[PDB]
Amino acid sequence: PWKGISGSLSRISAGSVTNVWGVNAANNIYRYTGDDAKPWVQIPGALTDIGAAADGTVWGVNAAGNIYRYVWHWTQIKGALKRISAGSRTNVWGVNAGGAIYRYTGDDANPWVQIPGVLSDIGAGADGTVWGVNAAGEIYRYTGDQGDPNHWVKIPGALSAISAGIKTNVWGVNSANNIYTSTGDDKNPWLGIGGSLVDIGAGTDGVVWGVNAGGGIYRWIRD
Amino acid sequence: PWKGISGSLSRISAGSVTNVWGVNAANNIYRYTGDDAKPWVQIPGALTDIGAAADGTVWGVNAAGNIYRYVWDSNHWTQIKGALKRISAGSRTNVWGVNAGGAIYRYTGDDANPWVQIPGVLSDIGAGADGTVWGVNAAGEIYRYTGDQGDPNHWVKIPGALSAISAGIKTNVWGVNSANNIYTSTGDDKNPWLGIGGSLVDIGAGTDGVVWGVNAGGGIYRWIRD
Amino acid sequence: PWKGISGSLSRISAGSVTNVWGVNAANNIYRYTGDDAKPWVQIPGALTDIGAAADGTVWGVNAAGNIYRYVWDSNHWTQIKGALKRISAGSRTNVWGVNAGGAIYRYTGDDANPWVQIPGVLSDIGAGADGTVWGVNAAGEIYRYTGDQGDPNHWVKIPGALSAISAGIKTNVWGVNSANNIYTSTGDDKNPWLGIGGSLVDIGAGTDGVVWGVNAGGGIYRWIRD
Amino acid sequence: PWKGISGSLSRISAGSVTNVWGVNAANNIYRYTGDDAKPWVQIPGALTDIGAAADGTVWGVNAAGNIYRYVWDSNHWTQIKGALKRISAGSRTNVWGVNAGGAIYRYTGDDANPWVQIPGVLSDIGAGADGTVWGVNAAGEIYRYTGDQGDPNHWVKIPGALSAISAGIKTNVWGVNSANNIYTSTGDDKNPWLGIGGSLVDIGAGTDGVVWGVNAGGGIYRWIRD
Numbered sequence: 001p002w003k004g005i006s007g008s009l010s011r012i013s014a015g016s017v018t019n020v021w022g023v024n025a026a027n028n029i030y031r032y033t034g035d036d037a038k039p040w041v042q043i044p045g046a047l048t049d050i051g052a053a054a055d056g057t058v059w060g061v062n063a064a065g066n067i068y069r070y071v072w073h074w075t076q077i078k079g080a081l082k083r084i085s086a087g088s089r090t091n092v093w094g095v096n097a098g099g100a101i102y103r104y105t106g107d108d109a110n111p112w113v114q115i116p117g118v119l120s121d122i123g124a125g126a127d128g129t130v131w132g133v134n135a136a137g138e139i140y141r142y143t144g145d146q147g148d149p150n151h152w153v154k155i156p157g158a159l160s161a162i163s164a165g166i167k168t169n170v171w172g173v174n175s176a177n178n179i180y181t182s183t184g185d186d187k188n189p190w191l192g193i194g195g196s197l198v199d200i201g202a203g204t205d206g207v208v209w210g211v212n213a214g215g216g217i218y219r220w221i222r223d
Numbered sequence: 224p225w226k227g228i229s230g231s232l233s234r235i236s237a238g239s240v241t242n243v244w245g246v247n248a249a250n251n252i253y254r255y256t257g258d259d260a261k262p263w264v265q266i267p268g269a270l271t272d273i274g275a276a277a278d279g280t281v282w283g284v285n286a287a288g289n290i291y292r293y294v295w296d297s298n299h300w301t302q303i304k305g306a307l308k309r310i311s312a313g314s315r316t317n318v319w320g321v322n323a324g325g326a327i328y329r330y331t332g333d334d335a336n337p338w339v340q341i342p343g344v345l346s347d348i349g350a351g352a353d354g355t356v357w358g359v360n361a362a363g364e365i366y367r368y369t370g371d372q373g374d375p376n377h378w379v380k381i382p383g384a385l386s387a388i389s390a391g392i393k394t395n396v397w398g399v400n401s402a403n404n405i406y407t408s409t410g411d412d413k414n415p416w417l418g419i420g421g422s423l424v425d426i427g428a429g430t431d432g433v434v435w436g437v438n439a440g441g442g443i444y445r446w447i448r449d
Numbered sequence: 450p451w452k453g454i455s456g457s458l459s460r461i462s463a464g465s466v467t468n469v470w471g472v473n474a475a476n477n478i479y480r481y482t483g484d485d486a487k488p489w490v491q492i493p494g495a496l497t498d499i500g501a502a503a504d505g506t507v508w509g510v511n512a513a514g515n516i517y518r519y520v521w522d523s524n525h526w527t528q529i530k531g532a533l534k535r536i537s538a539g540s541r542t543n544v545w546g547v548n549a550g551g552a553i554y555r556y557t558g559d560d561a562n563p564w565v566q567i568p569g570v571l572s573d574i575g576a577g578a579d580g581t582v583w584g585v586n587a588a589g590e591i592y593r594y595t596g597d598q599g600d601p602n603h604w605v606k607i608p609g610a611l612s613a614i615s616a617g618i619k620t621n622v623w624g625v626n627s628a629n630n631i632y633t634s635t636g637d638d639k640n641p642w643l644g645i646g647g648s649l650v651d652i653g654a655g656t657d658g659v660v661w662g663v664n665a666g667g668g669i670y671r672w673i674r675d
Numbered sequence: 676p677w678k679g680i681s682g683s684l685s686r687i688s689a690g691s692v693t694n695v696w697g698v699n700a701a702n703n704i705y706r707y708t709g710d711d712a713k714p715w716v717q718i719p720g721a722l723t724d725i726g727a728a729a730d731g732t733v734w735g736v737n738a739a740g741n742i743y744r745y746v747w748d749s750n751h752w753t754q755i756k757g758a759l760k761r762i763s764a765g766s767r768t769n770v771w772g773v774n775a776g777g778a779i780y781r782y783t784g785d786d787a788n789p790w791v792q793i794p795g796v797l798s799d800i801g802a803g804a805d806g807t808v809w810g811v812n813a814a815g816e817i818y819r820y821t822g823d824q825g826d827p828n829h830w831v832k833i834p835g836a837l838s839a840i841s842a843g844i845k846t847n848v849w850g851v852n853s854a855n856n857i858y859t860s861t862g863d864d865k866n867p868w869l870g871i872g873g874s875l876v877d878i879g880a881g882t883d884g885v886v887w888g889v890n891a892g893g894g895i896y897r898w899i900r901d
């Protein structure tokens with residue numbers, strides 16, 4: 001099931017059990033302390049989406065679309081994005097307000113390359129896994145680095161938010177707030193997990209965190 | 224070549240050099256200690272197959288078909304609903320099994336609804352930390368999973384014949400045939416197996432390259448490269 | 450058994466076979482080179498404890514209690530505000546320490562506000578790449594962190610007595626007691642430790658299975674399995 | 676020291692102990708089997724440089740400059756548009772090359788638009804699983820990539836001279852100079868290299884610490900620590 005963790009967040013990302021970040025409705029930024037009794041520290045800045053990777057990589061975008069990378073507070077990286085996901089230093093993707101899709105090049109002076117397609121959310125994993133959903137709710141998995149010249153393969157179902165920590169840990173929520181996890185069977189690809197969430201973050205190590213419409217925060221209790 | 228390790232085991236699984244478990248003919252459970260002078264510690268419980276992952280995840284099944292996950296606390300094991308005969312854990316997120324009728328199952332991550340059936344028929348399976356999955360059927364035919372890579376037939380047949388298989392990562396795949404001959408994957412599907420000297424009935428191939436096996440008389444071996 | 454490695458060190462930390470660091474009695478800092486013929490290179494600075502992670506992260510504290518993180522450039526170290534006496538780095542995201550009054554701290558990832566106090570009292574701590582954390586208190590009592598797993602008491606006591614502890618991953622946990630006796634975790638909380646021949650005063654257990662130690666006379670050892 | 680391994684190779688790359696590939700003077704391709712008694716299996720195709728990652732990713736270039744990625748199925752290789760002379764694969768997401776005019780390229784993850792030029796001029800490059808990238812230029816000057824860390828000049832020069840370099844992770848960086856002398860990085864940019872006994876013309880340094888090399892007469896060696 002799910003365990004409630006005190007606090008309020010509107011978007012959340014989990015790269016690993018030790019790297020979990022979110023933003024609240026007001027755009028305040030928080031990182032998970034590892035202490036469930038005192039679970040958040042506020043990190044200076046303002047963001048509306050955030051992507052936290054297994055290796056400690058953290059990227060975010062603000063309401064205007066400005067893009068930032070955490071420097072271990074924030075360095076702006078040129079461009080404009082509306083949603084962002086970071087699975088690792090080398091696998092960072094986002095989408096802009098118009099739905100265009102970009103992947104980070106690793107060159108801060110020329111930081112994005114556009115990837116053909118249209119998406120409204122995206123999840124990028126440490127292992128290179130990339131999944132997305134479009135405005136209508138259609139679901140895609142990236143194949144453009146695997147020889148597919150149409151880049152994306154549609155996977156049945158409908159989701160509004162998605163997160164991929166690894167090939168084997170992919171979760172999303174539909175517009176109704178129903179929660180799904182990928183089965184690993186493209187012909188029968190989702191299994192419903194009880195609960196209601198509006199955003200979700202799935203880590204490479206299996207950790208899964210989510211927030212519901214009211215801002216309540218949950219960690220999946222797999223044991 | 225192989226280094227002989229003291230003790231007696233019937234099935235074995237290796238996820239990493241620090242997470243290697245086995246079961247003996249009496250169904251006792253043992254974990255490798257890291258010291259070849261005192262290699263095994265008995266973990267309470269009874270199992271007939273076991274899967275141990277690099278991330279620490281350990282799953283097992285017993286003679287009745289009951290399914291267990293190790294909980295790393297003083298309760299030791301939790302029973303997960305269902306019935307399985309063989310099991311393999313590549314990681315927390317990549318756990319597969321085969322039931323007594325040869326049906327194939329993948330763990331869903333929901334203990335309340337824990338398995339989805341994956342099409343096919345197998346007799347042994349090996350799952351890895353990177354999502355890699357290989358299986359063998361009762362006639363010895365060998366398959367690698369493709370159902371998460373857009374293949375509507377779920378599995379691709381790889382030439383050869385094996386009776387047990389293990390695949391802790393895409394790059395470390397090993398099996399044995401019914402005659403106890405040992406093979407490792409070349410990574411070339413058109414020339415897929417290299418014979419390795421020795422004799423084993425079960426094998427465990429870790430994500431980190433460790434390889435452990437057991438032979439028909441209970442003898443235990445670890446692979447030595449240097 | 451242990452292989453003796455030349456040189457002299459007082460404390461040691463191993464994150465992986467390629468990231469092993471120590472300090473000597475003079476507070477000089479050394480990094481393992483990967484060649485047992487010329488095993489140490491002195492890194493400029495002065496420290497009394499050090500934590501080295503598999504991901505390359507290295508943290509240290511000096512005799513004054515000052516806290517440093519290695520920056521992997523010609524500046525070498527950056528001072529992080531606060532005071533600590535012992536430190537362990539499992540990864541960039543999992544760094545813990547204990548101060549001179551036994552209070553426990555976890556790194557927040559914000560150098561401007563770097564520590565949160567975790568309830569408890571300890572004298573040594575070992576943090577891993579998977580989030581695993583073990584500690585010991587001054588009476589030798591042993592604890593494993595549970596405060597990120599819903600436990601309002603933050604730690605579970607594990608039977609036994611140790612004075613130094615290291616835990617680079619859930620599956621590779623080692624310690625020494627005040628008499629210099631060496632123990633490794635069995636993974637069974639009801640039968641938790643296996644004695645290992647040898648004698649050490651500090652130990653470092655890597656994510657990849659590497660294990661290094663130092664003895665009371667400064668002697669340095671690496672664990673050999675094969 | 677080095678262990679000699681049978682066979683003959685001209686260039687080599689090691690991503691992990693289980694993913695090591697090379698090419699010989701005839702441009703034949705070989706993969707390491709894991710058994711030093713029968714160490715190589717020829718993989719069909721022709722290449723002049725190769726990069727093999729810990730995650731299984733393998734890229735290569737041929738004498739014409741054509742670029743290939745291994746597809747782990749019976750087709751073996753897929754050609755990727757462009758021309759390169761040297762290549763290194765740290766992981767699926769971190770692949771770099773140098774073309775015959777010394778221009779530097781990073782893989783974009785889009786086979787239809789596969790390369791972005793990174794400013795600079797190099798003659799060899801080594802990329803790691805953690806994003807680490809090192810290069811050398813034709814005069815032997817050594818650089819480490821900083822262009823993803825806010826540096827508008829993209830590279831920092833590290834003292835010394837090398838002709839081939841490999842960097843499977845931040846903590847395992849090795850090279851050779853034009854005189855075939857072997858060096859490993861100390862992690863101290865002000866005292867950056869340790870000389871290692873032996874003689875090699877190419878080297879591959881894995882994410883897991885494995886190190887392989889080849890010498891001018893085709894001789895193949897693996898580094899042994901214990």
Ligand SMILES: CO[C@H]1[C@H](O)[C@H](O)[C@H](C)O[C@@H]1[Se]C
Pocket residue numbers: 006007008009024025028030040
């Ligand atoms: C993460 O939850 C936040 C919440 O969003 C509020 O900002 C509140 C004032 O602070 C809590 Se953290 C105690």
Ligand SMILES: CO[C@H]1[C@H](O)[C@H](O)[C@H](C)O[C@@H]1[Se]C
Pocket residue numbers: 044045046047062063066068073074
């Ligand atoms: C990440 O937070 C940003 C914020 O969104 C504003 O752009 C502000 C002007 O700069 C801060 Se960076 C401290």
Ligand SMILES: CO[C@H]1[C@H](O)[C@H](O)[C@H](C)O[C@@H]1[Se]C
Pocket residue numbers: 078079080081096097100102112
């Ligand atoms: C990622 O930022 C994008 C931005 O969203 C615009 O599409 C702009 C036309 O292109 C930049 Se990338 C130069």
Ligand SMILES: CO[C@H]1[C@H](O)[C@H](O)[C@H](C)O[C@@H]1[Se]C
Pocket residue numbers: 116117118119134135138140150151152
């Ligand atoms: C991922 O982008 C999708 C897009 O959202 C549309 O569904 C379009 C019809 O197909 C593309 Se896939 C090139």
Ligand SMILES: CO[C@H]1[C@H](O)[C@H](O)[C@H](C)O[C@@H]1[Se]C
Pocket residue numbers: 156157158159174175178180190
């Ligand atoms: C993930 O897609 C879901 C979809 O959102 C609907 O809830 C539908 C009723 O079930 C599908 Se899963 C067959």
Ligand SMILES: CO[C@H]1[C@H](O)[C@H](O)[C@H](C)O[C@@H]1[Se]C
Pocket residue numbers: 001002194195196197212213216218
């Ligand atoms: C994660 O789903 C939550 C849901 O959002 C509601 O808060 C409900 C009251 O509790 C469930 Se937890 C089964």
Ligand SMILES: CO[C@H]1[C@H](O)[C@H](O)[C@H](C)O[C@@H]1[Se]C
Pocket residue numbers: 229230231232247248251253263264
């Ligand atoms: C692992 O080998 C075991 C063996 O299976 C027997 O249980 C025997 C009683 O003890 C040996 Se060593 C623990």
Ligand SMILES: CO[C@H]1[C@H](O)[C@H](O)[C@H](C)O[C@@H]1[Se]C
Pocket residue numbers: 267268269270283285289291299300
């Ligand atoms: C793993 O061992 C199992 C055992 O096989 C029995 O099913 C017993 C009922 O439960 C133990 Se675990 C309490």
Ligand SMILES: CO[C@H]1[C@H](O)[C@H](O)[C@H](C)O[C@@H]1[Se]C
Pocket residue numbers: 304305306307322323326328337338
């Ligand atoms: C994995 O367990 C299977 C079991 O073997 C049976 O096929 C049963 C009909 O379905 C269950 Se799925 C809980």
Ligand SMILES: CO[C@H]1[C@H](O)[C@H](O)[C@H](C)O[C@@H]1[Se]C
Pocket residue numbers: 342343344345358360364366376377378
């Ligand atoms: C893996 O399952 C195999 C099965 O063993 C049979 O060979 C059957 C003819 O093919 C299925 Se693949 C759908």
Ligand SMILES: CO[C@H]1[C@H](O)[C@H](O)[C@H](C)O[C@@H]1[Se]C
Pocket residue numbers: 382383384385400401404406416
């Ligand atoms: C792995 O398959 C083996 C098979 O089991 C037989 O030993 C056969 C003689 O050789 C094949 Se490898 C061509």
Ligand SMILES: CO[C@H]1[C@H](O)[C@H](O)[C@H](C)O[C@@H]1[Se]C
Pocket residue numbers: 455456457458473474477479489490
């Ligand atoms: C690591 O051992 C050191 C030792 O601590 C002394 O600094 C000595 C001067 O040199 C030996 Se070897 C570098």
Ligand SMILES: CO[C@H]1[C@H](O)[C@H](O)[C@H](C)O[C@@H]1[Se]C
Pocket residue numbers: 493494495496509511515517525526
């Ligand atoms: C790690 O070494 C430290 C040292 O202990 C001193 O505190 C000195 C003030 O700073 C050096 Se790093 C400049």
Ligand SMILES: CO[C@H]1[C@H](O)[C@H](O)[C@H](C)O[C@@H]1[Se]C
Pocket residue numbers: 530531532533548549552554563564
């Ligand atoms: C980690 O440093 C601690 C320090 O030891 C003191 O307890 C001080 C009162 O609080 C600081 Se937290 C910056």
Ligand SMILES: CO[C@H]1[C@H](O)[C@H](O)[C@H](C)O[C@@H]1[Se]C
Pocket residue numbers: 568569570571584586590592602603604
């Ligand atoms: C880890 O801290 C321990 C402490 O050392 C004491 O044993 C105390 C009685 O228990 C606390 Se656990 C809240």
Ligand SMILES: CO[C@H]1[C@H](O)[C@H](O)[C@H](C)O[C@@H]1[Se]C
Pocket residue numbers: 608609610611626627630632642
């Ligand atoms: C790790 O704990 C040790 C302890 O330090 C003593 O050596 C005691 C005699 O044995 C216990 Se292990 C039962």
